[PDB]
C-alpha cells in the first residue's frame, strides 16, 4: 500500500505512505512525537506544511519530489513557519530533506522557526523548477554551525552525510528545460516531469504519467493483447493496473480491478468476481444482480404500495415476500398513502426469483394478466403465507390469463388459485412438473372460469404447446415446446436452410447465427453462436474467425499487428517493415 491520500485543511493520526496523494500537513505536533512512518515518503503530489511544531527534527530522508499541484497560500509547496515554543526550549532545528531533488511547481517558504538552521546555505533554485516562483527563507535560527567541509557550503544539517547535492544545470533549447547536462545530446526523457540522472526512462526524478516499476511510462501495461495462435485479443500476461500513478501487478488490500485501473468499489454496469485470486469488475451485459427486502412477516412493509414500489427498480431477486393487497393497490388514506399507478407495476419485469411467497389478491382492472411477472422463473418458498402458501392468486375479477410465460419451478409451498371467474388456460397446467415432491392434496384450483366456458369462446392453448399445458394464449405463453423454441415463442423449425435471420439448434432452442456468417442455402449457415462456427464468412476471415475487417494496428506482445485481405478475403499478414499497414504482401505494398 504505497499511495495514500493527504489532508486538505491546515491525538496524532498517521499514514505509513510512500507517495502522498495530496498534501503532507504536520500542524501542532509534540516534542516527543515519533515520526518513523514519514521515513518512507518519497513523493508529495500537493504541498508540505510544517506549522507550529515542538519536535526537534523533521525526518523525511526519502523525499525526492514535491509536485506542488496543490499549493499553500496559493504560493508555496514547502511552508515551514512558527515551529518553536515561546517558553519551552523544544523547537524545530533541523530539516532532514537531504534527498529533495526538486519541486515541480510552487515556491518555498521557511520563516519564523526560531532555532531552524542550514536553510540559508541551500541553493533553492537547484530545487524549485518553477522559474517565476518565490523563495522566502529569512527570520529563522541564529548562531549555527558552518556546513561541514565535505558539503561545499551547502547542507541540510551539520553532519557529513547530510549535504545538498546540486542536480540542476543550464538546458539547451533542444531539451525544453529538461536535461542532465548542458550539451544538446544530454536531454531528458519524454516521461520525466522534471530532472535527470541520465537519458533512460528510469533516470527520472518524477514521472509525467506512470511509474511501471522504476521506469516512467505513459501507459500502464495493456490488459488485452492480440494472440497470433488464437487469432484474437487475449489477456496480456504482463498486465498492470493504475493504482494512483503507479503500475501494480496485483490490486491492493480490498481493491477491485475495473477496466485497467485499481478501484475502491465496482461501478453499477459491472459486478465483483474472483478469477485467478484477483477480484475484477466483469460487465453484466444489461442487468446486474440486485437484492431488495420485500413484504409479509418479518418485513416493515405489509403490501406493495405506491411508496415502497419504487424501491424494487432493477431488482432481480427479492430476499423475502411480495404482497399485492387492495390496501396498497387502492391506497390507504389513514396513513396518507396514495393509490398504486398500474404503469409502476412494470418494475417486476426484471424479477427472476422470490425467496419466499407471492400473494396477489388485488390487481388493476385493465391489466388482464400477470405479464409483469414474465421474467419470474423460480419461487423459493422459504417463508409462507396463510396455511403455508407460496403462490396465491385469488378474487381477481379481471384476470384472463396467468401470464407466467417463463416460470419453470416453485421449490416449496402450496398453490392457491380461486375466485378469478375470468381466468382460463390454468386447467391444462401440469403442476406436478412445476412443484417439487408430492403435489397430492396441496393443490388448490376452484371457483375460476371452467374449461367448458373457456373452450366455447376459443380460449385454448396453441397447437405448438406440449402435454404440460400453457400460461395463456399464443405460442409464447407455453410451458414446454413440442418442436423448437425461439425467444420463448414455440416455433415449428429454426431458420436452418431458409429465412431472414439464420439459426442453429441446441436442446430444441433456436439461436441466431453470428452476424459475420454468409447466409447459406440448402445447408446450415452455422453450428454455434461463435464467429468461428460459420459455414462461410460474409466479409473476411482472420484465422478461425469471420471478421468485419482485418486486424490493422491491433497491439500484440511484440508490437502492432497489421494484416490485409486476400483475393479470397482472407486476412494475410503484412511485411515486417510495414509500420503503418499494407495493401498487399510485398514491401512495395507498405502504406504511408
Amino acid at each position, epitope marked *: 500500500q504505497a499511495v495514500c491520500p493527504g489532508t486538505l485543511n491546515g491525538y496524532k493520526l498517521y499514514e505509513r505512505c510512500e507517495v502522498v496523494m495530496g498534501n503532507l500537513e504536520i500542524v501542532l505536533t509534540g516534542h516527543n512525537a515519533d515520526l518513523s512512518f514519514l521515513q518512507w515518503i518519497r513523493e508529495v503530489t500537493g504541498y508540505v506544511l510544517v506549522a507550529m511544531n515542538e519536535f526537534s527534527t523533521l525526518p523525511l530522508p526519502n523525499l525526492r519530489v514535491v509536485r506542488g499541484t496543490q499549493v499553500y497560500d496559493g504560493k508555496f509547496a514547502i511552508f515551514v513557519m512558527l515551529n518553536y515554543n515561546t517558553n519551552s526550549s523544544h523547537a524545530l532545528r533541523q530539516l532532514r530533506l537531504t534527498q529533495l531533488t526538486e519541486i515541480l511547481s510552487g515556491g518555498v517558504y521557511i520563516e519564523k522557526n526560531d532555532k531552524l538552521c542550514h536553510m540559508d546555505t541551500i541553493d533553492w533554485r537547484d530545487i524549485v523548477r518553477d522559474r517565476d516562483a518565490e523563495i522566502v527563507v529569512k527570520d529563522n535560527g541564529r548562531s549555527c554551525p558552518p556546513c561541514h567541509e565535505v558539503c561545499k557550503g551547502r547542507c541540510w544539517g551539520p553532519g557529513s552525510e547530510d549535504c545538498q547535492t546540486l542536480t540542476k544545470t543550464i538546458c539547451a533549447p533542444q531539451c525544453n528545460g529538461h536535461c542532465f547536462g548542458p550539451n544538446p545530446n544530454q536531454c531528458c526523457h519524454d516521461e520525466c516531469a522534471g530532472g535527470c540522472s541520465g537519458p533512460q526512462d528510469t533516470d527520472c526524478f518524477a514521472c509525467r504519467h506512470f511509474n511501471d516499476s522504476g521506469a516512467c511510462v505513459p501507459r500502464c501495461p495493456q490488459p488485452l493483447v492480440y*494472440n*497470433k*495462435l*488464437t*487469432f*484474437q485479443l*487475449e*489477456p*496480456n*500476461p504482463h498486465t498492470k493496473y493504475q493504482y494512483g500513478g503507479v503500475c501494480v501487478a496485483s490490486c491492493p488490500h480490498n481493491f477491485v480491478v475495473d477496466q485497467t485501473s485499481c478501484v475502491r468499489a465496482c461501478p453499477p454496469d459491472k459486478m465483483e468476481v474472483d478469477k*485467478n485470486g484477483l477480484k475484477m469488475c466483469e460487465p453484466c451485459g444489461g442487468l446486474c444482480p440486485k437484492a431488495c427486502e420485500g413484504t409479509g412477516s418479518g418485513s416493515r412493509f405489509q403490501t406493495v404500495d405506491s411508496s415502497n414500489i419504487d424501491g424494487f427498480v432493477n431488482c432481480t431477486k427479492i430476499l423475502g415476500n411480495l404482497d399485492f393487497l387492495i390496501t396498497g393497490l387502492n391506497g390507504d388514506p389513514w396513513h396518507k398513502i396514495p393509490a398504486l399507478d398500474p404503469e409502476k407495476l412494470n418494475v417486476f419485469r426484471t424479477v427472476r426469483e422470490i425467496t419466499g411467497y407471492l400473494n396477489i389478491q388485488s390487481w388493476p382492472p385493465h391489466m388482464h394478466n400477470f405479464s409483469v411477472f414474465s421474467n419470474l422463473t423460480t419461487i423459493g418458498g422459504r417463508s409462507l403465507y396463510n396455511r403455508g402458501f407460496s403462490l396465491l392468486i385469488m378474487k381477481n375479477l379481471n384476470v384472463t390469463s396467468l401470464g407466467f410465460r417463463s416460470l419453470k419451478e416453485i421449490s416449496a409451498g402450496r398453490i392457491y388459485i380461486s375466485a378469478n371467474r375470468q381466468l382460463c388456460y390454468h386447467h391444462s397446467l401440469n403442476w406436478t412438473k412445476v412443484l417439487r415432491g408430492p403435489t397430492e392434496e396441496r393443490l388448490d384450483i376452484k371457483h375460476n372460469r371452467p374449461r367448458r366456458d373457456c373452450v366455447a369462446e376459443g380460449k385454448v392453448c396453441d397447437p405448438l404447446c406440449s402435454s404440460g399445458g400453457c400460461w395463456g394464449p399464443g405460442p409464447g405463453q407455453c410451458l414446454s415446446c413440442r418442436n423448437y423454441s425461439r425467444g420463448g415463442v414455440c416455433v415449428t423449425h429454426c431458420n436452418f436452410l431458409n429465412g431472414e435471420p439464420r439459426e442453429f439448434a441446441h436442446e430444441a432452442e433456436c439461436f441466431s447465427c453470428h452476424p459475420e456468417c454468409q447466409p447459406m442455402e440448402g445447408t446450415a449457415t452455422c453450428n454455434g453462436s*461463435g464467429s*468461428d462456427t460459420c459455414a462461410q464468412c460474409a466479409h473476411f476471415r482472420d*484465422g*478461425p474467425h469471420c471478421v468485419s475487417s482485418c486486424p490493422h494496428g491491433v497491439l500484440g*506482445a*511484440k508490437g502492432p499487428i497489421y494484416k490485409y485481405p486476400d483475393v479470397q478475403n482472407e486476412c*494475410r*499478414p*503484412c*511485411h*515486417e517493415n510495414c509500420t503503418q499497414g499494407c495493401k498487399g*504482401p510485398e514491401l512495395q505494398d507498405c502504406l504511408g
Partner: antibody, heavy 116, light 108 residues
C-alpha cells in the same frame, strides 16, 4: 517454468483417455495452451489449442468430434479428453505453451498406445 | 491450409561447417515462422520466432532469415551438440503447421 504430462498409456481401439498437463513456475492462467502430438517416428502435428480463459477451443480436423480440450486454472492443470481412439492416434503427446511468439515451454510428452 | 516443406530431409556436415536449412511455405506467411530443435527422445526447443528473431539464451551460432515463402535456418559453426531434427512453424494461418524436419548430423 515447466509442464508435466500424465495419463498417456495404452488404450484399446475405440477407447478413451484423459491426458493431464501440470503447469508450474508461471502464471498458467494467463497463457493460451496447446497439445502437439508425435507419432513414432515422424514429424510434429498440432493437435488442439485452448484460450487463456478457456472460452475458445480449437481442434485440428483429424481430432475433431473426438478429443476435447479443457483446463482447470485453479488446479493449474490442462486436459485432453480423447475419445473413440483410433490406432492412428498413437503418438507422444506434448503439452506446450504459446509464449509471446512461438511455443516457448513444452512438457516431456506422454506416450499413448492404441492397441487391442 | 499452408503446407511447410523443409529441405533437405537429412544433412551431413563436419564440426565447424556453415549448415543451412531451408523452408518454403505453400502460401504467403510474412515473417511468422518459428524454428525448433529436437534432440532424440526430448521435447522440441524453440530457437527462432519472428523468422530471424532469436529466443533467449539460444547460442549465437543459430540464425534465421526470410519473409513470405522461402526461409533459412543457419548454424554459423556446426557443433557436436547441434545434432537434432529441426522443425518449421507457420503461425500466420489456421491450423498452425510444421515442417517435416531436417535431420542434421555430424560428418566426422
Amino acid at each position: 517454468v515447466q509442464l508435466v504430462e500424465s495419463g498417456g498409456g495404452l488404450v484399446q481401439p475405440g477407447g478413451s483417455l484423459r491426458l493431464s498437463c501440470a503447469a508450474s513456475g508461471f502464471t498458467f492462467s494467463s497463457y493460451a495452451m496447446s497439445w502437439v502430438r508425435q507419432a513414432p517416428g515422424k514429424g510434429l502435428e498440432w493437435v488442439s489449442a485452448i484460450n487463456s480463459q478457456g472460452k475458445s477451443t480449437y481442434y485440428a480436423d483429424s481430432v475433431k468430434g473426438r478429443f476435447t480440450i479443457s483446463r482447470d486454472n485453479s488446479k493449474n492443470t490442462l486436459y485432453l479428453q480423447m475419445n473413440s481412439l483410433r490406432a492412428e492416434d498413437t503418438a507422444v503427446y506434448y503439452c506446450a505453451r504459446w509464449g509471446d511468439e512461438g511455443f516457448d515451454i513444452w512438457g516431456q510428452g506422454t506416450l499413448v498406445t492404441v492397441s487391442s | 491450409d499452408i503446407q511447410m516443406t523443409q529441405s533437405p530431409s537429412s544433412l551431413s556436415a563436419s564440426v565447424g561447417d556453415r549448415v543451412t536449412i531451408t523452408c518454403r511455405a505453400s502460401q504467403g506467411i510474412s515473417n511468422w515462422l518459428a524454428w525448433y530443435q529436437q534432440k532424440p527422445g526430448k521435447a522440441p526447443k524453440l530457437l527462432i520466432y519472428g523468422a530471424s528473431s532469436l529466443q533467449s539464451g539460444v547460442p549465437s551460432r543459430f540464425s534465421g532469415s526470410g519473409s513470405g515463402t522461402d526461409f533459412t535456418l543457419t548454424i554459423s559453426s556446426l557443433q557436436p551438440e547441434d545434432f537434432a531434427v529441426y522443425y518449421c512453424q507457420q503461425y500466420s494461418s489456421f491450423p498452425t503447421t510444421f515442417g517435416q524436419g531436417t535431420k542434421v548430423e555430424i560428418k566426422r
